[PDB]
Design a protein around this ligand. Sequence first.
Ligand code: SF4
Lengths: 232, 98, 55, 49
Amino acid sequence: MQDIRQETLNECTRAEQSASVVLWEIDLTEVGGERYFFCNEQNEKGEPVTWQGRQYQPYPIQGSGFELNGKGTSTRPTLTVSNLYGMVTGMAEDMQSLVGGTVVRRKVYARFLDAVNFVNGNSYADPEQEVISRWRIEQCSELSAVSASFVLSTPTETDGAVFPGRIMLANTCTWTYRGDECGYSGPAVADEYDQPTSDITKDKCSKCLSGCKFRNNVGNFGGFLSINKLSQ
Amino acid sequence: ITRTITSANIDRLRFTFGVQALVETTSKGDRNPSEVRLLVQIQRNGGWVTEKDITIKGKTTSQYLASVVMGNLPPRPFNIRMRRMTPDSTTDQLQNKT
Amino acid sequence: NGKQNTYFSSLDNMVAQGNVLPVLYGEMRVGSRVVSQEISTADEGDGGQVVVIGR
Amino acid sequence: VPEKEAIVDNGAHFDGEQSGTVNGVTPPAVQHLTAEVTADSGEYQVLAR
Ligand code: SF4
C-alpha cells in the first residue's frame, strides 16, 4: 500500500469529487536535453496549469495502459502526444528518438491545486498531495504529421541481460578505459590503432596487449593470456 | 668459474650443474659411490654470499645434471660464480669431476 | 547414463575461452575453469640453503 | 546511410603473428638423453635417462 496522504484518501471516498488532473514531465537530462513539462488542458483563467512552481504547459498528451502486475511479462504502457506543429520531430532528431529518457506522471486532484489557477483562489491548496510513478521511454512506435506515439517501460527491465556477464578472452581486455577496473590515469600515449599521439582528445586503448603495454599497465589486463593453447 | 649478469628484467636465476661420474673402483675391481660438494655464490653488498650448499652422492658413469632456482636477485650489475669444496681427485680410481 | 544435473553446482574443471567467470555465493565444493597447465622437470632445491641430492 | 562502408572496411588493429608458428603445442626435444651399460647385476643392461 502506497503511503497516500490522508486528505487524498478523504477526497477519494467522497460522493461528489473535484476534477482529476494528470501532470506529465518528460526528463531528458540523462540523454542530454532539457526537461519538458506538459498538461492536457488549461486552467480556469486560460493560463498554464500551476502546480507548486512548475507551471505545466497545455499540450495534447495522453497515456493509457498503466498497470501493476508481476505475474507475467512487463507492463509496457503507451503514451501518445501530438506534433502537428513539429515539436516532437525536433526533439527526436536532436536527441536520437528520445529513447532512454524519463517520464514522470503525477495525479493531483483539482481541489488541492495551486491558488493561482482559480480566479477566486483556493482555500484548500496543499502542495504535498500527489501520486508519482516513474518510467523510461523505450521506443517511438510511430511518428507522422498528426501525432507521435511512444511505448514506455519499467526502469528495472531484464530483456537483454544475462547474469554473469564477464567473458574470459585470450587476447582482448574487457575493462573500460581509464575506468575503476583498469586504473590508469596519466598522459595520453597512443591511439586506438597503436599509433603514438599526445592529444588527450584522441587517446583510446586498442584493448590489445600492445595497447596495454603502451600504458605499462600489463598488471591490470582484463583478459587471460595463453588460454587458446589450452582450449585447443 | 665466474660470470656476470647484465639483463635488466629478470626475476629468478637457475643454475644447472652436475658431475661427469662418481664411481670409485677398488683394487680388486669393486665399484662404490662417492660424494662431492659445490657452492653457488652471488655478490650481494660487497662480499660473496654462498646461496646454497650442494651435496651429490651416488654411483653413475654418465653425466647427472641437476638444477636449483635462486631468488631475491640484487640489482643487475651483480655477478655470479660457482666453486668446488672437494679436493681435486689425484688417484685415477676416484672419478669425481664437477 | 541418468546422472541428474542442476544449475547451481559444477564439480569438474572446464575450459576457459569463451566462457563466463563463475560466481560463488555460499560454502560449496567447486571445480574451476583452467587458466594454465604445464608439465616440466622439478628443481632439486627445496628453498633452504642446504640441499642434498641422492642418498 | 552509405557512409558506413568505409567505417566497416577499415577493420581494427590486431596484435600478434599471422603465421603463429613460433610456439604451437608441439613438445620440444627431451633435455638430457644418456645411456649407460652396466654389468653390476651380472648381466649387460642399458639404462636410459
Ligand atoms: S588493455 Fe590495459 S590499458 Fe587498455 S583497458 Fe585493458 S587494462 Fe586498461
